């Protein structure tokens, strides 16, 4: 019976957005299961489908809206509804596919794609890479518009890919990372439209293996270094959780919590 969080690109503040993200994290996460200070998303196994998702209503100064579905375990996007159609990504397995059926049930046209929603897959369809794809509010306005318009087929596929690539980032990743949230914050703040820098990107690709590195750390100290990039592309290794604290907001459950 899923909980929804509205947002509108329309007039949006720095506050209104921080307001937004700070909010969906709440609806995402267990409250406290936290390792060495970082919050852990709910664990796919126990989770009843009742609690498996949350929904996000996104609206426009162009005055239209669409609803996104998010895997609570995941934080990522599984699909969306625009009006009377709903679209979902190709499920990576049996279990996952049964869950989605619980999503937009009212919808008369349920479409399911042949491809995953991994960045790799989308970048391929977008025909471009994430760093050629501008992020910001203007981008997100036009993105929502597109997804709606997609359901009507006024919009092409690579256009749709690009739109997803925008949202997954501006939401799933913003939610996963205060760093990414705060970057969008200042993007809105100075009203810039610009593609994601490397730091943002490598963050996005390493999120899975950070979640692992951390929970499995010894009292915060990483088993093995995790290579990252700074805003300028300069590579650097992460040996300890201490520095991630200010950055990463959520981790996918990996191991049973320590004693």
């Amino acid at each position, epitope marked *: 019976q899923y909980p929804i969080i509205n947002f509108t690109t329309a007039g949006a503040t720095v506050q209104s957005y921080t307001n937004f993200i700070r909010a969906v994290r709440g609806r995402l996460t267990t409250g406290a299961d936290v390792r060495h200070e970082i919050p852990v998303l709910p664990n796919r196994v126990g989770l009843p489908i009742n609690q498996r998702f949350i929904l996000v209503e996104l609206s426009n100064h162009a005055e239209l809206s669409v609803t996104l579905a998010l895997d609570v375990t995941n934080a990522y996007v599984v699909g969306y509804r625009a009006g009377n159609s709903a679209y979902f990504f190709h499920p990576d397995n049996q279990e996952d596919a049964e869950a989605i059926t619980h999503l937009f049930t009212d919808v008369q046209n349920r479409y399911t794609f042949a491809f995953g929603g991994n960045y790799d897959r989308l970048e391929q369809l977008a*025909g471009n890479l994430r760093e050629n794809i501008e992020l910001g*509010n203007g981008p997100l306005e036009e993105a929502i518009s597109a997804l709606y318009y997609y359901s009507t087929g006024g919009t092409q596929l690579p256009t749709l890919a*690009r739109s997803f690539i925008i949202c997954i980032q501006m939401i799933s990743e913003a939610a996963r990372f205060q760093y990414i949230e705060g970057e969008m914050r200042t993007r809105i703040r100075y009203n810039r439209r*610009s593609a994601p820098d490397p730091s943002v990107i490598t963050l996005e690709n390493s999120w899975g293996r950070l979640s692992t590195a951390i929970q499995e750390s010894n009292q915060g100290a990483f088993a093995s270094p995790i290579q990252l990039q700074r805003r300028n592309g300069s590579k650097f290794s992460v040996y300890d959780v201490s520095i991630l604290i200010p950055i990463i907001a959520l981790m996918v459950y990996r191991c049973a919590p320590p004693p």
Partner: nanobody, 123 residues
């Protein structure tokens, strides 16, 4: 249903003539770029020229670089075509790229919405 772009100005000139294309965007705000592509029947869309919204940097495809000039208005956008060669004969299109970093986007794949088109011809 889409953003609904349209261009006028197509026609017949003698070889060497000049011609000028015009375009109108119809709830449309953030752009990051707009560009004109041309397609001879049976072939695929050549890039031609584009103007990065924001800055207004102009970028022209190889064959045309010197004779064609591009400009933004307000809404509205323009392509000047000067000294026409019979090889310019083709269908010309308007594109709104709402997404790609404006410098990097030169391709049919890179633009989100397409104008309807208007024809061009020559000696």
């Amino acid at each position: 249903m889409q953003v609904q772009l349209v261009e006028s100005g197509g026609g017949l000139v003698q070889a060497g003539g000049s011609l000028r294309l015009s375009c109108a965007a119809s709830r449309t705000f953030s752009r990051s770029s707009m560009g004109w592509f041309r397609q001879a029947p049976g072939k695929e869309r050549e890039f031609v020229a584009s103007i990065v919204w924001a800055d207004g940097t102009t970028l022209y495809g190889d064959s045309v670089k010197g004779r064609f000039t591009v400009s933004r208005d307000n809404n509205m956008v323009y392509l000047q075509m000067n000294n026409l060669k019979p090889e310019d004969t083709a269908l010309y299109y308007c594109a709104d790229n709402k997404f790609v970093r404006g410098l990097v986007a030169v391709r049919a794949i890179d633009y989100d919405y397409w104008g309807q088109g208007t024809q061009v011809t020559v000696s």
